[PDB]
Amino acid sequence: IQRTPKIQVYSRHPAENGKSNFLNCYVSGFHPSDIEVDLLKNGERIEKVEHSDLSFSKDWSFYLLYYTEFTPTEKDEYACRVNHVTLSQPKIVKWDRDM
């Protein structure tokens, strides 16, 4: 019995074009624990991405935060790409500053 990840893409601070910030991708509610998460800039995989230590919620499902420094612009598009045993293909969630 397996559980598919929930995914949220957001900034540490309110986004302000030309001001340094952090781009976050929070994956949660998933089981088992193996998972692949990429952060994308204009569809390209960002190389230096860190993540939190593996831990889990009271219902046993796992959660991880993936993050990296970024400076948002009006033009650049950002995204989180996730794969998990429950997914037939990678799921892409776009960064929306209002979400």
Partner: protein, 276 residues
């Protein structure tokens, strides 16, 4: 306030890819403060919050021994559970444990917790009496009997009422500037038309600690539970958390809707409306 300490153990088998990985993380409330990972280049307990760094080498070596020995025992346990469920040697499986103590506002022990799971399902749990067990199935019963025979519950109880509380209190004092500080949410309401008929009102809570928070929409003073879109509380990465709740309302009825925010950092519960 009230406070708790929890450790989270995860042991994952991976047939054909080496021995099972063991990782432990420790938390005080919503602040992680240690980790251990058997897959690290050099496995050792590592600090994850500034207020724990002052602990001496004796403390770090004691933790590392505990986690190294557990690493080996959980590999035995994974082998044992494989057999209790008549499972093939081909599959990957996971045992999780989470345990700790809760204190009340007075610093007194409220209760202890010690629960375990196998492949994401309840397996065996120590009851609130810290004396008896609840086993999920006939497999967990084998574990129950072995733990009853070895008087394991008395070991867990002795820790939970003793060292657990003592050290939690120690951490609470050393990290009091953060652990005992509640930061209230910064809030605001956004408005976005979804059509000529309707609009989205979104209530935002940012920068709060701890994660526990209540965000609700009301229409004419009635809760809109079913019609409210409520995202999971999420970490910002600076210790604080974020959350929002959204509702789609008839255009022109915006002022009939109020957002209510409860948080420990709030000297008074908040009511917000959209401010055009």
């Amino acid at each position: 306030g009230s406070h708790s300490m929890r450790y989270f153990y995860t042991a994952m088998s991976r047939p054909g890819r080496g021995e099972p990985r063991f990782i432990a993380v420790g938390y005080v409330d919503d602040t992680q403060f240690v980790r251990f990972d058997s897959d690290a280049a050099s496995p050792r307990t590592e600090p994850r919050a500034p207020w724990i760094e002052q602990e001496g080498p004796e403390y770090w070596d004691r933790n590392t021994q505990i986690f190294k020995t557990n690493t080996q025992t959980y590999r035995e346990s994974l082998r044992n559970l494989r057999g209790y469920y008549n499972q093939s040697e081909a599959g990957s499986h996971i045992i999780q444990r989470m345990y700790g103590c809760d204190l009340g506002p007075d610093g007194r022990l409220l209760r202890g917790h010690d629960q375990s799971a196998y492949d994401g399902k309840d397996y065996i749990a120590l009851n609130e009496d810290l004396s008896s067990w609840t086993a999920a199935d006939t497999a967990a019963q084998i574990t129950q009997r072995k733990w009853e025979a070895a008087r394991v519950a008395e070991q867990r109880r002795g820790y939970l009422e003793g060292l657990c509380v003592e050290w939690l209190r120690r951490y609470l004092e050393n990290g009091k500037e953060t652990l005992q500080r509640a930061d209230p949410p910064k809030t605001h309401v956004t408005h976005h038309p979804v059509s000529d008929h309707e609009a989205t009102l979104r209530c935002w809570a940012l920068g709060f600690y701890p994660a526990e928070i209540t965000l609700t929409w009301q229409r004419d003073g009635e809760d809109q539970t079913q019609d409210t879109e409520l995202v999971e509380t999420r970490p910002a990465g600076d210790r604080t958390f974020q959350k929002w709740a959204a509702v789609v309302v008839p255009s022109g009825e915006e002022q009939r809707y109020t957002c209510h925010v409860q948080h420990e950092g709030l000297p008074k519960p908040l009511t917000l409306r959209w401010e055009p």
